Amino acid sequence: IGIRLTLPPPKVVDRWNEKRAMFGVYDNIGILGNFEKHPKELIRGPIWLRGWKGNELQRCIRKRKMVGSRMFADDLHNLNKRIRYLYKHFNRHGKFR
Amino acid sequence: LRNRVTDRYFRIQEVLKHARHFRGRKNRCYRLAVRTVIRAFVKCTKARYLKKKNMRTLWINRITAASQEHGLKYPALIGNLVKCQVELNRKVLADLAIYEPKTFKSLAALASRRRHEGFAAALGDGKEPEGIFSRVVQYH
Amino acid sequence: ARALDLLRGLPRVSLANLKPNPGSKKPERRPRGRRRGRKCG
Amino acid sequence: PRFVSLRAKQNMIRRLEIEAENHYWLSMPYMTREQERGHAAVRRREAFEAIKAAATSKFPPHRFIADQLDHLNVTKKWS
Amino acid sequence: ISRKWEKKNKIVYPPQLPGEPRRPAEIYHCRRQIKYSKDKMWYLAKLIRGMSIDQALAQLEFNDKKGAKIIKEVLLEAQDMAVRDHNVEFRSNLYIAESTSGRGQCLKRIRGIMEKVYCHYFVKLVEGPPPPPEPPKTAVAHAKEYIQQLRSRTIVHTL
């Protein structure tokens, strides 16, 4: 019977955390800081998807050409096979054409 | 598992509260209880038609029996009560047959009197006076 | 404008009141249930 | 093999009688075909101009400020 | 694992009143992980289900099955704790109210899986003479039942 018998511990959430209180600040650093930075230069993450959005085949292609030279061996290998699979899927399979 | 289903005891129990009175494993095993419960609900809605039908044949059995006690048959009673503008229905006639058998006897007398006036009227054909109970009340 | 004058009488705009312009968001159709998926289109 | 009862013959016959009287009442029109011509052309034209007019008057509804602001009431509280 | 039957000897009732019948004693005892199957214990457990404990002991001393000796140890043990621990004055004055057998935690032996079967044995003894067996119902009981069913019937689907 996959249901729990006692109700779980309560989820104490601090809405006035440092992160929550200061979320969203400097999203308008462009439009009211004389366009010296874009907001996309505010985001932190992988180097191949800072200010870039793609589907999965494009994320894999971009990751391979941007960081693929210093990827580990079997990660590089898995990623080559994922591009090869996702190529054969987006280009040859589906409903609409 | 990002989001797997937590609230599944209650989906099962929505089905199985309807099966608690079956036999065998249909009362407990969702896979069996679903087929039987669906099938029970389909019977439950098609049985509304048969409830109405079977009440009516039950009433015709009771009116038939009670009118055979007075020598009439069922077509004679119903026909010749329509012809008196007594538009009682089968439910009421069956209930009068059981609970008020003098009213039912007098209705059988009114229907057999009308039946004989039908005979005598459709025997002596031509312009004649109509029967007394044969007269109709015109509504305008 | 009469419309800001409407905004006086209403509770404050918060992150709990917000709503997209009706017509913006078409709902996602996904293959679950009797209609959207058995052969799934 | 299926055979024909008295019910079936009497039923068939009363349908034939209704049919024969339909034949009778269709045997005496009130007008000739020359007389009826265009006697209802105006009402037919107006009727179709109404169909045509409801077809060509199709457009999105008006959008109001009061509806959009009235969504703010979902956090109306007591004091 | 649950162990609710051992705890049942720990219910304490509030003391009675002088204008109130004497409550009979109730002695819940069991044994766990008997190496025997639960459906062979069902016959031995079923055999003794309303007997006095002397009749139960006597019937289990002459039974050839393996479980009979185990149940006899459980009943002698429960007769002891009946008198020592639970204030039953007469050893003789008990009867078996409940005698069941559940399955125990079985083992699995790979040969090809084969289960090493275990079982439990649950007995409630109740202080008092064993209740008289139910008499077979007579033709008077059948006739009264039938006539009462005839008196019971209604005019159906009417007023």
Add this chain to the structure above:
Amino acid sequence: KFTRSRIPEKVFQASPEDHEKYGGDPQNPHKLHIVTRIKSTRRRPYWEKDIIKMLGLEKAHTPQVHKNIPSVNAKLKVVKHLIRIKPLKLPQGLPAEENMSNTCLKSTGELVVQWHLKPV
């Protein structure tokens, strides 16, 4: 092949015997028909289904008024096996705006323009 059936004109020519049978006069005929669907369009060709939809006889046992003109009579001749036709007779006049609400079409075929619910 099953096709659409023409019916000859001798079928729609009354005889004085028929004027004795039904209640008709060849001189001064009736203006309005009452048409009622008494048979289903199922198991009938699609053209008869259409004519039933045009005449406004989708529901059975519901009377509909038509004109006794040769166009409407042509459509009625196509589906004359599904319908029933009687002349709309009018004992009193056609209803004025005073008697517009208080009418009732009786079973006889007449349309009475004063419909009380009292006995005579």
Add this chain to the structure above:
Amino acid sequence: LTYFSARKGKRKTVKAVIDRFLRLHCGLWVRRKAGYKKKLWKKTPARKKRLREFVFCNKTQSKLLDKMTTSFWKRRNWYVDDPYQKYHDRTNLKV
């Protein structure tokens, strides 16, 4: 066609399509007639006049050719002395 290339992740044009057809900016594809330069010795001059024509394409042929090329080919082109330039904008349609 290729919906996502392996290098760019872009759509690709089918170059057969470009090699045979002409996209006018209004959406009409112009083509040449099949067999306009074959077996001219056995064709009547009416038929040869019919084959030497620039023939528009169907609606579904047009949408099939739109899907097989990319947005580069759908673009305004202000050439110098273009022969087809008066046929780009569509005059005087009443839908």
Add this chain to the structure above:
Amino acid sequence: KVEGDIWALQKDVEDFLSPLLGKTPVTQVNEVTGTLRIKGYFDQELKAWLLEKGF
């Protein structure tokens, strides 16, 4: 960019275009954005008309 009462503007546009059509033009005000959307091209007539009105 209609700022103010869009319903007066819908009444006045509807009174302006109906001789050029016979019928009242079928419109849609969008009171939120402050637009007014008429069916059929009347761009030159409304630009000239709004120059007459002084906007």
Add this chain to the structure above:
Amino acid sequence: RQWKVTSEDLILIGNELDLACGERIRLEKVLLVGADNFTLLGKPLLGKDLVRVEATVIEKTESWPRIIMRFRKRKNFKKKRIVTTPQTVLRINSIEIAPCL
């Protein structure tokens, strides 16, 4: 429908009558009236000056939930609906009769 009715009893009607609970009602359309030794039956209704049947509204309930399921095999055709009709209960107070023959 035709209800056979005495005084002091109950009728359950399958629609909301849009009356307040407690309101008295004269039921017209009585078409048989019987006593022990005589009956009176109308063609088809009795005179309003002859018989008077009164009834109060007691309660205005809904029905028990009432299932409507459809199912066709091999077609993936399974609908389910649950319906509760409104109902009012009438208490027939009196059948008064009058000497108008």
Add this chain to the structure above:
RNA sequence: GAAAUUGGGCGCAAUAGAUAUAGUACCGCAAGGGAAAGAUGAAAAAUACCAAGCAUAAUAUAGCAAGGACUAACCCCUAUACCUUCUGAUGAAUUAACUAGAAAUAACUUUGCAAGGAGAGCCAAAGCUAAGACCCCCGAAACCAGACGA
């Protein structure tokens, strides 16, 4: 398919996440394949109620096992199991958990701005920008490369 040129977590939380408590146990001559599982409490120097399956409690004329009912469980009446494949045989003992629709060219809807739109590149004879909204799971015999095997 170029180039010139340009310039910590809206993660998982013991069938999940790593195969991993371990490359262990086990299987294989070997290369190699490859598991499962734990839950007290502050202190152990303090020993409930819920799956299927059963038991308490075997059975009573008759029949997809119910439904209409009914004073009444049965008796009366009505009722050719579900999925899938065909115009109209397949698979499933049962329970729990796991297990299958991924793409925004064009069109549409909703905003912004508008002869211009876009935070360069691009489009524009009302357009352009932004968003929303469309494209599944399992299953061969094979072929090739490199090892391990008499």
Add this chain to the structure above:
RNA sequence: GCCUGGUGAUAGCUGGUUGUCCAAGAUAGAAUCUUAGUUCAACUUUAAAUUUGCCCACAGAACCAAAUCCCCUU
């Protein structure tokens, strides 16, 4: 041979595709190493613009049966 890899091989073939409720919805064909499949059409669906559609009366449609086409009125 067997193992690992390519490898989520490929499969026009088999099997399977998980909440609710409502709505609209079934039978011309042409090509194809094609007839276990696809493409176009036909039919189907939504949205949009407009103006006729359907039923049909005279007249009318060839020499060597039932009907149909056409078609104003209605």
Add this chain to the structure above:
RNA sequence: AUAACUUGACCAACGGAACAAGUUACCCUAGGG
């Protein structure tokens, strides 16, 4: 092929693959009757 105009298949399996035969009771797999 031809400077060009043009010309080029019994591509006859005739909407035409630029050029590929017999056989398997050793057949094999996926399916259908």
